[PDB]
Design a protein around this nucleic acid. Structure first.
Lengths: 49, 66, 204, 64, 101, 102
RNA sequence: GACGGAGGGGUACCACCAGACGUGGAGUCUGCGGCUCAAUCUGACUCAACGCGCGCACCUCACCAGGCCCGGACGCGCGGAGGACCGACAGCCGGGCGCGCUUUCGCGAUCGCGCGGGUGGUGGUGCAUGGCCGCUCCCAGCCCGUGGCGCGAGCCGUCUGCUCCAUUGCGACAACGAGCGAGACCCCGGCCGCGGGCGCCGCGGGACGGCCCGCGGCAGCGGGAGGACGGCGGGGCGAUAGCAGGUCUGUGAUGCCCUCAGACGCCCUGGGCCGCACGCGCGCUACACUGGCGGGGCCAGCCGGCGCCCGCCAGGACGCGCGGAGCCCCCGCCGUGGCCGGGACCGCGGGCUGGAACGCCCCCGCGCACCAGGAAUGUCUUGUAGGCGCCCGCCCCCACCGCG
């Protein structure tokens, strides 16, 4: 089975908090979701004007 | 133009009720210096303190005529 | 050069702090979890966790703080003895929204009439010296239709920078049986040791 | 679908009755009367006014 | 059938018993869990399958021997007294030997 | 003498927690000759995310900035004196003070 | 109170005025309907759907055509250790795979089977919900304590006047004081100072309708200077209530149907999501002489790497530690010609990134419509509109998009 299990190799970039591939915010180190990120931005410290 | 709000207005009267001689009729800096004497009149922020002083200057100007 | 990779490790550490706040919330919520702060010294991590009941957090023999130290370090690629955790007590518990919201979450799962419990949370912050507390319970409260029952007591403020400082907020997704309700406790403490309201003019 | 007489005789006897746990009658129908096990479990009700001969059954359940 | 080498079963018990805990990022694609090492019968250095540890882990939480908490895509399993006895029985250690914590 | 210029790089997101630490570095190293702070031009980490979890409605965006503050000092003093300075300086949790040897 | 297809007042470039620069007319780019399909996965449809759910060769991916795999935990009754369970060379069959088949070897209780009872599902239902945004709201309302008036529900306060950007204040007045929202605050900017300085970056001032002249009881209403700065600088935050707005397809948010093994789980390959008689939305490039085409200067800011060699290029090899637009200007040229205006389509090629183009880049052809756009419709007040480039977001490649 392992001959083909995940035989394709591609990035599977996923949000660290959620696990979702779509819209991963890889601006820098963060790979956070866009819907996962504005929820925890105060803990990461990012804040608005 | 700029319309004074109730905080910037009620406090100005309270300052002219308590203090009369210290503020003068056309003296913004003096009116800002009297209103800045720490505990006697405490207004956080220069912007509020400056606005209070301008209304005090206008009230002080009004009282001197009558 | 502008590489400056020191910022990248600072960012990586904060991401771990966000994970820490999420892990502690799941486990130490019974143990009064309110918040966590990460400290790095000379390659040493020690976390300050603010909690209402340090004794449950600590465990007997401090085996619970040890087991979770071993886990968090093992997860974050550190070794125990290269890291440790420190639990602090909460005084004036009412002014802490995160503590109050879990208290509300407990009494709601204990089938208490909602308005009775909401005024009980409000009174626990009213005793603590908060100017006001606002409790919003939203969900299928006994009915298929959803209504949000806002209970409030005393003044609360909602606009400008003094909201970030003076007003604390706390949302808990209490999963009631019918679906999921949401309890939001907000406490407004007008006076704190540092900053003061930028409007309040004292006038002598 | 016509019910087999042996199931009907048990309906009259009381081995399979509307007034029973849903699963217990299902085991009896599959283990003695060669019924489809899923269908026996999904039986909605008995008929007519009382629970005599006459059954109503549910769908395949993949499409339920 | 995820036939599990008893070395992988034996290794996790010890790794977990020493720490009284385990962290597993949830990974189900072919991978080797970091931090667990099983010595192969030829003296080789080997890392246990992310799948294999997960399969053994699914059994332990299901048994009720070990507790789990989950945050940010990482499992946070911890030892409980119920399985301290079992893990010692597997590790051959006794009530006198305690998780190093 | 094992005397080397010792680099001290401080990163604090909080300007006031970092600015008070700059006073701390200056005082402890007054004896060991700490340097005046060369403040890094602020590096702002900027992420703009749509406020809507579902992308419908008027386009509203969240402008989020991590205004990390880095301050660097260099001390040509003893390693035991550099170490006294690290113990002496105020410990603010969540503040990165990093040392390199030149 | 909620409505009215009722009367008044008020207000806003998501209104108008006065102007601007547009779109709708052409080619294309992208989304939307329809159409076509094996599938064209889907939400969203006035404002408040339609470059929207931040880049679809693969993955994503939910859809189609096939094909693996248990990764079904725990608990019980039975089974099994000389043998539970799965692996495999070679040939056939099959895109290919010990998938099956021929075969006869391995393998070691990680377990089989029956029953229960799970775990997972970008499955449904946002009209069961939490949360979070949109919208009313590029508005200005929302309350309370004490008194007055009512038998009360209650009203007054919170006012058919004036002022404002504003329920912002004045004035009148059974009201009198408070609060929340407004403002204040926070962020950035211009200017002065202080302290520091791998690097301009920390703290303090400064501006208040202050002054002056009018006109006003008044709040203020025009004008005048002085001054970086002038009368809400360019943003964040955002009340009381809401609404069957949108999202179960962001999440280990979730109630219910839970599909659950020839699977809607989870992987691999191939294809689609980009198919096109057509109608529309956001755009881009045009229709040229205020321009195209050649060389010559020079120039940014968000914030910023380059060297060398080979190559027309696009790029490649080998290195090191580092660097910057266009418009515009200056000189030639074309000379009103669908022309050197315009670059759409298509025939070679040369490259790039990847496992693989169908993706992009480049080069030589090829030079479509379009000579200023009908009814209509949009957005806008000074570093503004417009014009011009640049950066990032997402990304293997790639921006006619968005955020700056």
């Amino acid at each position: 089975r392992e001959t083909e299990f995940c035989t394709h190799i591609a990035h599977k970039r996923e949000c660290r908090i959620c696990g979702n591939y779509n819209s991963v915010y890889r601006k820098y180190g963060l790979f956070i979701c866009r819907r996962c990120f504005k929820e925890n931005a105060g803990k990461i410290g990012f804040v608005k004007l | 133009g700029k319309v004074r709000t109730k905080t910037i207005k009620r406090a100005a009267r309270k300052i002219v009720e308590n203090n009369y001689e210290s503020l003068k009729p056309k003296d913004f800096q003096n009116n800002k210096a009297i209103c800045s004497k720490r505990n006697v009149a405490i207004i956080p922020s220069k912007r509020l303190r400056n606005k209070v002083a301008g209304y005090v200057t206008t009230l002080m100007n009004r009282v001197v005529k009558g | 050069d502008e590489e400056n990779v020191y910022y990248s490790k600072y960012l990586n550490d904060c991401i771990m702090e966000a994970e820490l706040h999420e892990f502690f919330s799941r486990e130490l919520v019974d143990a009064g979890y309110a918040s966590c702060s990460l400290c790095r010294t000379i390659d040493s991590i020690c976390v300050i966790i603010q909690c209402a009941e340090p004794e449950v957090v600590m465990g007997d023999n401090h085996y619970r703080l040890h087991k979770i130290e071993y886990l968090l370090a093992g997860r974050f690629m550190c070794d125990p003895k290269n890291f440790n955790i420190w639990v602090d007590k909460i005084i004036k518990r009412g002014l802490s929204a995160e503590i109050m919201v879990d208290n509300l979450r407990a009494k709601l799962e204990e089938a208490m009439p909602i308005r009775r419990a909401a005024y009980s949370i409000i009174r626990t912050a009213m005793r603590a010296g908060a100017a006001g507390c606002e409790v919003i319970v939203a969900g299928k409260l006994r009915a298929q239709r959803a209504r949000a029952n806002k209970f409030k007591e005393g003044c609360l403020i909602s606009t400008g920078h003094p909201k970030r400082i003076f007003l604390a907020e706390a949302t808990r997704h209490i999963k009631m049986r019918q679906g999921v309700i949401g309890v939001k406790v907000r406490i407004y403490n007008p006076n704190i040791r540092g900053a003061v309201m930028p409007d309040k003019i004292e006038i002598g | 679908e016509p019910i087999s007489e042996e199931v009907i005789e048990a309906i009259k006897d009381g081995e399979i009755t509307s007034e029973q746990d849903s699963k217990v009658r299902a085991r009896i129908l599959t283990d003695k009367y060669g019924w489809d096990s899923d269908e026996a479990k999904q039986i909605w009700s008995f008929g007519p006014v009382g629970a005599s001969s006459g059954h109503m059954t549910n769908l395949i359940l993949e499409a339920t | 059938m995820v036939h599990i080498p008893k070395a992988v079963y034996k290794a996790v018990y010890a790794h977990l018993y020493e720490n009284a805990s385990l962290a597993l990022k949830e990974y189900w694609r072919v991978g080797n869990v970091p931090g667990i090492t099983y010595v192969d019968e030829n003296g080789k250095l080997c890392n246990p399958t992310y799948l294999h540890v997960n399969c053994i882990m699914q059994s332990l939480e299901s048994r009720g021997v070990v507790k789990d908490t989950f945050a940010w895509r990482h499992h946070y399993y911890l030892l409980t007294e119920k399985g301290e006895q079992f893990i010692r029985k597997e590790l051959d250690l006794t009530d006198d030997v305690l998780p190093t914590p | 003498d094992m005397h080397q210029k010792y680099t001290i790089i401080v990163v604090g997101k909080d300007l006031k927690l970092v600015e008070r630490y700059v006073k701390s570095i200056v005082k402890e190293g007054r004896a060991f000759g700490i340097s005046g702070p060369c403040r890094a031009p602020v590096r702002r980490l900027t992420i703009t995310t749509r406020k809507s979890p579902c992308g419908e409605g008027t386009n509203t965006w969240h402008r989020f900035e991590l205004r990390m503050y880095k301050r660097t000092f260099w001390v040509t003093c003893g390693g035991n004196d550099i170490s006294t300075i690290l113990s002496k300086t105020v410990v603010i949790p969540g503040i990165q003070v990093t040392v390199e040897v030149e």
